[PDB]
């Protein structure tokens, strides 16, 4: 697989670059997933435990504060960050599978995006 | 190896090199009221000065305005920077404590 960093050194460099960028802000890759981009993300976010979502929101606030101040996390806090520790992808995949099941049986969608 | 048809005159500055104007800035073709010697170069420079004034008669007022207002606007930019940073310092120097680590 060309996306696997264990095989492609280009993929490995890509992953290292993204990880360094996320680490500078204390953000997780899943924190970049926004509930306003997709309704499925909103649903998955709503299914997660309060503590996970609270930690996400705190990380987002910390990152926004750093972005406003033109400063990165101190190097000691950068050493303990986990940029690719996942909390969202499994829930999102389950939500997408459920929506596909609903569509395959002719049911109405459980939620819809508003027309802007 | 370049030939010019009758009624035209060679001038390398003119596009194509063949102009219908004959050479007119011949030495002492004019006489100057201030006794300035009217060589071809002198009259060329003077007539270009006159033509440049004719094309842009507002130039001196424009440059005075430009100097004045660019200086004033630079002062205003320094003040605007101070104003913005004064208003934003309470946000930029704030200490934020949150529960989350990774």
């Amino acid at each position: 697989r060309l996306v696997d960093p264990r095989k492609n050194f280009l993929a490995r460099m890509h992953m290292k670059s993204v990880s360094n960028r996320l680490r500078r802000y204390g953000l997780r890759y899943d924190d970049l997933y926004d509930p306003l981009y997709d309704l499925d993300i909103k649903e998955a976010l709503n299914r997660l435990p309060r503590e996970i979502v609270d930690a996400r929101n705190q990380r987002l606030m910390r990152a926004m504060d750093l972005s406003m101040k033109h400063e990165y996390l101190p190097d000691n806090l950068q050493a303990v960050q986990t940029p690719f520790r996942s909390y969202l992808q499994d829930m999102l995949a389950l939500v997408k599978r459920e929506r596909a099941e609903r569509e395959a049986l002719g049911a109405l969608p459980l939620y819809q995006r508003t027309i802007p | 190896g370049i030939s010019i048809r009758e009624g035209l005159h060679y001038n390398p500055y003119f596009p194509g090199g063949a102009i219908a104007m004959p050479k007119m800035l011949n030495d002492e073709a004019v006489e100057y009221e201030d006794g300035t010697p009217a060589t071809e170069a002198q009259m060329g420079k003077d007539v270009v000065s006159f033509l440049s004034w004719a094309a842009e008669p507002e130039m001196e007022e424009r440059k005075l305005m430009g100097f004045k207002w660019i200086f004033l606007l630079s002062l205003a930019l320094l003040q605007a920077a101070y104003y913005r940073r004064l208003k934003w310092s309470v946000l930029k120097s704030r200490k934020l404590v949150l529960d989350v680590v990774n």
Partner: peptide
């Protein structure tokens, strides 16, 4: 080091 999961 990052905390364990």
């Amino acid at each position: 080091s990052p905390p364990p999961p």
